[PDB]
Design a protein around this nucleic acid. Sequence first.
DNA 1: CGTACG
DNA 2: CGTACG
Lengths: 62, 65
Amino acid sequence: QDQEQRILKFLEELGEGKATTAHDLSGKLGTPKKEINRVLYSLAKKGKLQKEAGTPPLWKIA
Amino acid sequence: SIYQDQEQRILKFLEELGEGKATTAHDLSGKLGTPKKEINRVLYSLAKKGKLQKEAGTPPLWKIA
DNA sequence: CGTACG
DNA sequence: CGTACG
């Protein structure tokens, strides 16, 4: 769970209104974008995050 | 070169398969014992270079063109 | 579930 | 280039 909480903690420390990219999260958290994404898409299905469609997608606390 | 070996192993498996016949990167991966990802890398490469023909689908089919 | 992508 | 994929 280390990552899930870690990602939310970051998105919480960066304004509930401001989004962000997985790549962004990766470079800031020192973690593989692939793992970042699985974590992100999961939180999104759980409805914990808000995925903003597009290329690339944008993530922000729900 | 390992990369070229795998390229050749792919070309040989499809030449033996039969020019008009095709198969998935999955079968290719299981038969040559190489992760499906790498197979796809060589496959799209060889396709780019016209040596192989991709038959769109889910999943795609590959054959010697 | 297609994914090839580095 | 969107890729999360076991």
